[PDB]
């Protein structure tokens, strides 16, 4: 009942809001499928405000408010909600122009970024110093603390590992309200727990991100296949350890035949002439699906850079088996490539097709069963439907993941990131997509495929235990008991709430 002085001070300064405008904005997310109103929203102006909130919660017998840390709210199923609790509007930590919330190291070996900062700003600040993070996410308008609480993957993860494998240290305020700086050498238990920890142990206020000298441009290429075996074999060849090959980025896409021409055109990569040739190829092979590897080779402004890239690319391509003559090239500034999805957002939003339900299906599928997944899903379940949204598929190397961290991955040395990014655009098409997702998961369970979901929150304890693995689960729980004893943090994950 009584309020600690530092907590009341937050309300007095207008940082704790309970108005419908504040609570409503913090009640929905990108998923646009689930929603939950919090009792209040906190707009912290410094990390001290966060210490005050968490300290109050930890020292107040009977504290009944769960606490969530909202970054950009790109969660899909309410992971950033605090039902009847307090949602922290993390962005507020960056309202002040000084002191800066992003500082590139004096020696240019790393960049310190506030947990609330979005990667697009981290990128700009880094480039201003001639450097840039090594591992990214496909979309840059996500927060550092947000992607780090999951894993943070993209086409560079095969060689640099996810974003959680590229963090030197962090400042974290635990459920106890204590500010702790952690790394592999200090408070490593908290360090490993928080990375991929789904916001269960504390709030990341600062993350030290590893960087590399910034490349100036990216030779961007797409290779087309009608044969999945060749497609996957080539992705594995390009991402296999040698130390890794030349490619800086490697992803893949699945195009179902029904809407082939339209989807290829909507990639913003192919010309109408390219599209016509690919459509013709599909008909010739009588394919129900077309596959495309997407890769890049980063290079700088050196006078001989462009020519070197042409030779390097020619060599790499010579080792592949895409359909003869179906290699397509583009050349753009590094930043433009990295922020490519923002353009897709702008276009979709104008059409009112961005802010719609997103029943996205994301999972890691062991290499040994990816061909079965292709048969049962791409060539099976998905056939006959009108797909809206990209179907992304690409291999990852387990060697670049730290299994000591909270993030869960399949046991195999190589596993695929499979992201079926369905957009519910048609009238009331959501129910159909949700059922289709359950069917896909059912197919995998019955086939005995040992996949791991990503960005999904389970609603049954047995599912979370299987997710992390029993032994790893006990470790997760031990860290929960040590850092969030009252089980108040990020209740939307539905692990301890
Ligand atoms: C929305 C979204 C988008 C748009 C994107 C993305 N991305 C990603 C993926 C992929 C995708 N892709 C795509 C594409 N391509 C081409 N085209 C296209 N389109 C679309 N898309 C997924 C699937 C990438 O890339 N990668 C990854 O990995 N991921 C991603 N994503 C997802 C994310 O990451 C998530 O969402 C996260 O979460 C982040 O976000 P944010 O917003 O930042 O956050 P939130 O939601 O708010 O939250 C979450 C959680 O956590 C926690 N926290 C926060 N913060 C913090 C924390 N803790 C501690 N500390 C701190 N600081 C909370 O509480 C919760 O629980 C995507 C998406
Ligand atoms: C970035 O560097 C600045 C200094 O160059 C840091 O600024 C200090 O920030 C703390 C709280 O974050 C304040 O109490 C100090 O008054 C600030 N001092 C200065 C020099 O203004 C800032 O913390 C750093 N942030 C990052 C990205 O780690
Ligand atoms: C790939 O999809 C196209 C349509 O997107 C199919 O072509 C249609 O086929 C029906 C029945 O054969 C014809 O009546 C239509 O006139 C065709 N439309 C087009 C686009 O020309 C094609 O059959 C599909 N191919 C495969 C292998 O599934
Ligand atoms: C072109 O591809 C289509 C689709 O793979 C072939 O038609 C399939 O034929 C099998 C066996 O006859 C059926 O089980 C499928 O249902 C058919 N596809 C669908 C869903 O319509 C077709 O035979 C191929 N053309 C040839 C003979 O080369
Ligand atoms: C979904 O988004 C629409 C429009 O953006 C909004 O009217 C609706 O309240 C949202 N529903 C949920 C569950 O977020
Ligand atoms: C690379 O060259 C472009 C155009 O000349 C320039 O804008 C950019 O700053 C250069 N990259 C570096 C070294 O910052």
UniProtKB/Swiss-Prot annotation:
Q: Which PROSITE patterns does the UniProt entry name for this protein?
A: FAD_PCMH, OX2_COVAL_FAD
What keywords appear on the UniProt entry?
Answer: FAD, Flavoprotein, Glycoprotein, Oxidoreductase, Secreted, Signal
The listed locations are: Secreted, Extracellular space
Pros-8alpha-FAD histidine: residues carrying this PTM? 74
Residues noted as binding trans-zeatin in the record, renumbered to the chain: 138, 344, 419
Which of this chain's residues are annotated to bind FAD?
Answer: 69, 71-73, 75, 79, 138, 143, 149, 153, 204, 454, 490, 493
Listed GO CC annotations: extracellular region
Which cofactors? FAD
A single GO BP annotation from the record?
A: cytokinin metabolic process
Predominant place of localization: secreted
Q: Which residues form the FAD-binding PCMH-type domain?
A: 34-214
A GO molecular-function annotation:
cytokinin dehydrogenase activity
Chain positions recorded as N(6)-dimethylallyladenine binding sites = 138, 344
What Enzyme Commission number does this protein have? 1.5.99.12
- What does the entry report regarding how activity is regulated? Competitive inhibition by phenylureas.
Query: What does the PTM comment of the record read?
Result: Glycosylated; with approximately 10 hexose residues per site.
The catalytic activity, as recorded, is: N(6)-dimethylallyladenine + A + H2O = 3-methyl-2-butenal + adenine + AH2
InterPro entries in the record:
Cytok_DH_C_sf (IPR016170), Cytokinin_DH_FAD/cytokin-bd (IPR015345), FAD-bd_PCMH (IPR016166), FAD-bd_PCMH-like_sf (IPR036318), FAD-bd_PCMH_sub1 (IPR016167), FAD-bd_PCMH_sub2 (IPR016169), FAD-linked_Oxase-like_C (IPR016164), FAD-linked_Oxidoreductases_BP (IPR050432)
Q: What Pfam families does the record tag this protein with? A: Cytokin-bind (PF09265), FAD_binding_4 (PF01565)
State the source organism's domain of life: Eukaryota
Q: Which family does it belong to?
A: Belongs to the oxygen-dependent FAD-linked oxidoreductase family.
Q: What does this protein do?
A: Catalyzes the oxidation of cytokinins, a family of N(6)-substituted adenine derivatives that are plant hormones, where the substituent is an isopentenyl group. Cleaves trans-zeatin, N(6)-dimethylallyladenine (isopentenyladenine), isopentenyladenosine, zeatin riboside and cis-zeatin, but not dihydrozeatin, kinetin and benzylaminopurine.
Question: What binding partners and quaternary form does the record give?
Answer: Monomer.
What this protein is called in its record is: Cytokinin dehydrogenase 1
Q: What is the lineage of its organism?
A: Eukaryota, Viridiplantae, Streptophyta, Embryophyta, Tracheophyta
């Amino acid at each position: 009942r009584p309020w600690p002085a530092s907590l009341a001070a937050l309300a007095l300064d207008g940082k704790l809001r309970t108005d419908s405008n504040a609570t409503a904005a913090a009640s929905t997310d990108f998923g646009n499928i689930t929603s939950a109103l919090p009792a209040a929203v906190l707009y912290p102006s410094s990390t001290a405000d966060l210490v005050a909130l968490l300290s109050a919660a930890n020292s107040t017998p009977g504290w009944p408010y769960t606490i969530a840390f909202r970054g950009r709210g790109h969660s899909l199923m309410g992971q950033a909600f605090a039902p009847g609790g307090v949602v922290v509007n993390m962005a507020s930590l960056g309202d002040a122009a000084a002191p800066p919330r992003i500082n590139v190291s004096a020696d240019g070996r790393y960049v310190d970024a506030g947990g609330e900062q979005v990667w697009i700003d981290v990128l700009r600040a880094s480039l201003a110093r001639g450097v840039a993070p090594r591992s990214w996410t496909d979309y840059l308008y996500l927060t550092v603390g947000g992607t780090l609480s999951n894993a943070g993957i993209s086409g560079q993860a095969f060689r640099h590992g996810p974003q959680i494998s590229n963090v030197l240290e962090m400042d974290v305020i635990t459920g106890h309200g204590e500010m702790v700086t952690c790394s592999k050498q200090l408070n490593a238990d908290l360090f490993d727990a928080v990375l991929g920890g789904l916001g269960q142990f504390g709030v990341i206020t600062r993350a030290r991100i590893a960087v590399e000298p910034a490349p100036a441009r990216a030779r961007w290429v797409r290779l087309v296949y009608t044969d999945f075996a060749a497609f996957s074999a080539d992705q594995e060849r390009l991402t296999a350890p040698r130390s890794f090959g030349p490619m800086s980025y490697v992803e893949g896409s699945v195009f179902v035949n029904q809407s082939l021409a339209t989807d290829l055109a909507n990639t913003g990569f192919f010309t109408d002439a390219d599209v016509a040739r690919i459509v013709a190829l599909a008909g010739e092979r009588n394919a129900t699906t077309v596959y495309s590897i997407e890769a890049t080779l980063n290079y700088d402004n050196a006078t001989a850079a462009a020519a070197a890239v042409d030779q390097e690319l020619a060599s790499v391509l010579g080792t592949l088996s895409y359909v003869e003559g179906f290699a397509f090239q583009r050349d753009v500034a590094y930043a433009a490539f990295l922020d490519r999805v923002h353009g897709e957002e702008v276009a979709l939003n104008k059409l009112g097709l961005w802010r719609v339900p997103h029943p996205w299906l994301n999972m890691f599928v062991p290499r040994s069963r990816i061909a079965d997944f292709d048969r049962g899903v791409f060539k099976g379940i998905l056939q006959g439907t009108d797909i809206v949204g990209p179907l992304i598929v690409y291999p990852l190397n387990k060697s670049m993941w730290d299994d000591g961290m909270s993030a869960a991955t399949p046991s195999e040395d190589v596993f695929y990131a499979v992201s079926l990014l369905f957009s519910s655009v048609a009238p009331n098409d959501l129910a159909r997509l949700q059922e289709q997702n359950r069917r896909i998961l059912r197919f995998c369970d019955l086939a005995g495929i040992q996949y791991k979901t990503y960005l999904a929150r389970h609603t049954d304890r047995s599912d979370w235990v299987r997710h992390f693995g029993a032994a790893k689960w006990n470790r997760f729980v031990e860290m929960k008991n040590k850092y969030d004893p009252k089980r108040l943090l990020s209740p939307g994950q539905d692990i301890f709430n």
